[PDB]
């Protein structure tokens, strides 16, 4: 039941050096895991960059390199370019099957940091008449394109019935996302205070409302 | 130019079957290992398997050999994936990828990838969306106000959302769909001057081509 672990997200600036890592649940990564690195760019464009731990794929820019570092496989970008903003997947071989890590979103700062605009909407009266309630939290104009969203109802974090889209590009090249809280109408009626909390670059933006 | 094109995806019922094809151009396909990888919505890559040039060796993820058969036809320069007994968790984009083996025959990279073909497994019937207004709660003032449109529970994708029949376009944001209770939901928002709403009417228009429907929802204060 081998599991491959990567940083969820890293940020660097153009010209800097950044290293991404890749860990195995079986122990140290070795050359016998033949670590691969695959880059995902927008519109689901995948490209192999590194194979067999430290071989660049033919035609790949020299700023990409691979190595083992301690327990882990590593991808280093030495002199990052804005075009290197992308999701990077590592993949490790375990004798007879290949396992991908969860991917690292790499931001290479290509515009200023921008905090999210957050809007929280209550259920509509028309929806409530169907005995259902959906709260909607919209999140726009943020960069880097990484957020965490949490919901609270009368001080209770919601662990069932919340759903958040993965960030997607706006026409102005910032990012947007939406989050949903699904309740029954009776639940809506039985609670008072509702909050959507958006954390971006270590700061939380909170919007809340009170029913009725 | 090394180039791939996948086909054979689409909507299939649970327990149904389909065969995906990956056509390879620009290289001698009969000399390369070929692999299948997929990506469920919002998620990362999952390997499916790979097959060597003469098909004497196939490696596969153990959980999927029950459903999936990898094969190839070197005369057609094509890689195949037969999918049977399909399940909701098979909803994903499916990619083929070439295996490049380096000098020394002891290192590889998955160098070139196809653009992917989409498979959706669902028993949902065609379902038009329930469209609801998103208006601020009953109310402190700023110079702009953000309004919205909840497009709840439709099938299949897509819907098209406009504001005031296309006349409001700047600062409209229509968000990706989520899947809940086997139906799709998305939202759209628009920002207008506080002096404009609710004095002037703001309406979202939602069309669902598969239902041949198009509905309007005026955004009214709470
Ligand atoms: C993921 N997959 C790629 C192709 C293949 C392979 C690997 C490593 C080094 C190789 O040289 C190599 O070639 C084949 C096969 O011989 C053995 C394992 C498979 C595996 C890993």
């Amino acid at each position: 039941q081998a599991v491959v672990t990567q940083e969820s997200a890293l940020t660097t600036s153009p010209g800097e050096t950044v290293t991404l890592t890749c860990r195995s649940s079986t122990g140290a990564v070795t050359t016998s895991n033949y670590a691969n690195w695959v880059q995902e760019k927008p519109d689901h464009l995948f490209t192999g960059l590194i194979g067999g731990t430290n071989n660049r794929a033919p035609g790949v820019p020299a700023r990409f390199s691979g190595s083992l570092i301690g327990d882990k496989a590593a991808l280093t970008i030495t002199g990052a370019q804005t075009e290197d903003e992308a999701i990077y997947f590592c993949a490790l071989w375990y004798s007879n099957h290949l396992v991908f890590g969860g991917g690292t979103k790499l931001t290479v700062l290509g515009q200023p940091k921008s905090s999210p605009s957050v809007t929280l909407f209550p259920p509509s009266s028309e929806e409530l008449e169907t005995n259902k309630a959906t709260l909607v939290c919209t999140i726009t104009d943020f960069y880097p394109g990484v957020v965490t969203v949490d919901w609270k109802v009368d001080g209770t974090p919601v662990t069932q019935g919340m759903e958040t889209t993965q960030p997607s590009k706006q026409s102005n090249n910032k990012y947007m996302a939406s989050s949903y809280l699904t309740l029954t109408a009776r639940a809506w009626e039985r609670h008072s205070s509702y909050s959507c909390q958006v954390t971006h670059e270590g700061h939380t933006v909170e919007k809340s409302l009170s029913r009725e | 130019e090394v180039k791939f094109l996948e086909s054979g995806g689409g909507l299939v019922q649970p327990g149904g079957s389909l065969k995906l094809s990956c056509a390879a151009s620009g290289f001698d396909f009969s000399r390369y290992w070929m692999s299948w990888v997929r990506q469920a919505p919002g998620k990362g890559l999952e390997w499916i398997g790979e097959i060597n040039p003469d098909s004497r060796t196939i490696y596969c993820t153990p959980s999927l050999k029950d459903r999936f058969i990898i094969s190839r036809d070197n005369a057609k320069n094509t890689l195949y994936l037969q999918m049977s007994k399909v399940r909701s968790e098979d909803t994903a984009l499916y990619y083929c990828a070439r295996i490049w083996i380096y000098y020394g025959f002891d290192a590889y990279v998955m160098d070139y990838w196809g653009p992917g073909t989409s498979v959706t497994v669902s028993s949902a019937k065609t379902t038009p969306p329930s469209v609801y207004p998103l208006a601020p709660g009953s109310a402190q003032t700023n110079s702009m106000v953000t309004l919205g449109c909840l497009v709840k529970g439709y099938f299949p994708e897509p819907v098209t959302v406009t504001w005031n029949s296309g006349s409001l376009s700047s600062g409209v944001h229509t968000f990706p769909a989520v899947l809940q209770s086997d139906l799709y939901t998305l939202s759209s928002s628009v920002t207008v001057p506080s002096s404009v709403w609710p004095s002037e009417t703001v309406t979202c228009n939602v069309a669902h081509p598969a239902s041949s429907t198009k509905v309007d929802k005026k955004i009214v204060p709470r």
Side-chain angles (χ1 to χ4, degrees), chain B residues 12-33:
Chain B
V12 62
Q13 299 300 296
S17 325
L18 68 174
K19 196 159 181 193
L20 308 184
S21 295
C22 159
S25 297
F27 67 101
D28 186 357
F29 175 91
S30 77
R31 302 186 74 76
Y32 295 85
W33 290 77

Side-chain angles (χ1 to χ4, degrees), chain A:
Chain A
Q1 192 174 96
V3 166
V4 179
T5 299
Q6 293 181 256
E7 300 90 350
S8 60
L10 293 174
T11 295
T12 191
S13 318
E16 298 196 341
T17 296
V18 65
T19 299
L20 278 67
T21 72
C22 178
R23 177 171 284 297
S24 176
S25 62
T26 71
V29 183
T30 64
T31 53
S32 301
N33 299 125
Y34 303 98
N36 263 233
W37 292 87
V38 184
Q39 182 199 67
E40 182 187 359
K41 274 199 226 183
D43 317 325
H44 312 286
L45 181 32
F46 291 87
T47 305
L49 298 187
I50 300 290
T53 311
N54 59 16
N55 307 107
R56 269 178 307 261
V60 169
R63 66 179 179 274
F64 296 99
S65 71
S67 64
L68 303 177
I69 304 180
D71 274 355
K72 296 187 296 179
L75 174 75
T76 302
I77 310 176
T78 300
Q81 303 303 129
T82 50
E83 70 185 287
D84 304 333
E85 180 155 325
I87 299 177
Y88 294 84
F89 292 92
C90 75
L92 302 184
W93 181 250
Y94 296 98
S95 299
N96 62 14
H97 69 121
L98 190 71
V99 182
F100 286 96
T104 302
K105 176 53 190 302
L106 179 64
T107 295
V108 182
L109 295 169
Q111 64 187 285
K113 297 197 182 197
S114 187
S115 310
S117 290
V118 183
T119 310
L120 177 62
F121 297 103
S124 73
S125 305
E126 189 187 341
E127 193 190 12
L128 288 168
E129 298 167 5
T130 79
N131 201 29
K132 303 317 186 179
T134 306
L135 290 82
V136 182
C137 183
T138 62
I139 314 167
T140 69
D141 302 291
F142 62 93
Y143 183 81
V146 179
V147 292
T148 63
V149 184
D150 203 357
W151 288 86
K152 281 173 180 72
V153 180
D154 293 324
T156 303
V158 182
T159 53
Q160 288 293 289
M162 80 144 90
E163 178 83 32
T164 300
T165 60
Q166 292 298 109
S168 60
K169 275 282 192 179
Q170 297 187 181
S171 65
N172 74 357
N173 236 36
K174 304 184 183 192
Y175 287 87
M176 74 188 179
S178 62
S179 193
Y180 294 97
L181 172 62
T182 292
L183 304 174
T184 67
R186 177 167 60 188
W188 168 253
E189 290 159 3
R190 285 192 79 217
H191 297 92
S192 302
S193 178
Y194 299 81
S195 168
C196 74
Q197 309 191 323
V198 181
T199 308
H200 181 257
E201 301 292 289
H203 169 89
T204 305
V205 178
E206 175 177 56
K207 295 302 172 73
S208 64
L209 57 83
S210 302
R211 175 181 53 66
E212 182 184 309

Side-chain angles (χ1 to χ4, degrees), chain B:
Chain B
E1 172 185 19
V2 172
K3 183 143 252 273
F4 290 114
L5 49 75
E6 298 96 337
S7 72
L11 175 59
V12 62
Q13 299 300 296
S17 325
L18 68 174
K19 196 159 181 193
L20 308 184
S21 295
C22 159
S25 297
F27 67 101
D28 186 357
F29 175 91
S30 77
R31 302 186 74 76
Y32 295 85
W33 290 77
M34 292 296 297
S35 59
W36 284 110
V37 180
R38 67 181 182 179
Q39 187 179 27
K43 295 169 39 176
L45 298 184
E46 176 176 32
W47 190 75
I48 295 171
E50 69 185 359
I51 182 166
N52 88 307
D54 73 355
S55 307
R56 87 174 65 182
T57 305
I58 298 172
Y59 300 118
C60 185
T61 194
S63 62
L64 298 183
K65 309 150 37 53
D66 178 52
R67 277 201 298 321
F68 297 4
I69 308 294
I70 304 176
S71 65
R72 65 191 294 156
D73 182 345
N74 289 342
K76 298 179 190 172
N77 262 39
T78 296
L79 174 75
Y80 306 98
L81 188 73
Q82 178 67 48
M83 300 168 68
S84 69
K85 309 159 55 172
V86 297
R87 312 182 63 81
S88 305
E89 55 261 51
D90 299 325
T91 293
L93 290 171
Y94 288 74
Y95 309 96
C96 61
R98 190 175 74 167
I99 303 309
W100 177 269
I101 297 174
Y102 292 86
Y103 184 103
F105 206 69
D106 200 33
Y108 86 100
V109 66
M110 289 152 94
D111 51 0
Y112 295 96
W113 293 59
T117 189
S118 174
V119 176
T120 304
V121 185
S122 177
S123 60
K125 281 158 154 223
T126 304
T127 299
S130 304
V131 180
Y132 302 109
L134 306 176
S138 306
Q140 300 306 307
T141 294
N142 170 55
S143 294
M144 302 288 314
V145 63
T146 297
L147 307 175
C149 184
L150 170 65
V151 186
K152 186 189 177 190
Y154 60 93
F155 187 91
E157 298 196 87
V159 288
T160 69
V161 187
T162 58
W163 288 92
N164 290 359
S165 298
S167 312
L168 287 178
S169 63
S170 74
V172 172
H173 296 301
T174 299
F175 298 90
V178 302
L179 178 67
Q180 32 180 252
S181 303
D182 298 346
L183 301 171
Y184 294 99
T185 290
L186 65 65
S187 298
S188 186
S189 67
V190 65
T191 304
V192 303
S194 302
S195 53
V196 170
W197 182 92
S199 320
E200 310 300 345
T201 304
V202 177
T203 302
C204 71
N205 326 105
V206 180
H208 187 227
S211 308
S212 304
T213 58
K214 184 182 199 73
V215 304
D216 292 355
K217 189 63 54 158
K218 183 197 217 193
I219 309 309
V220 168
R222 311 183 54 101

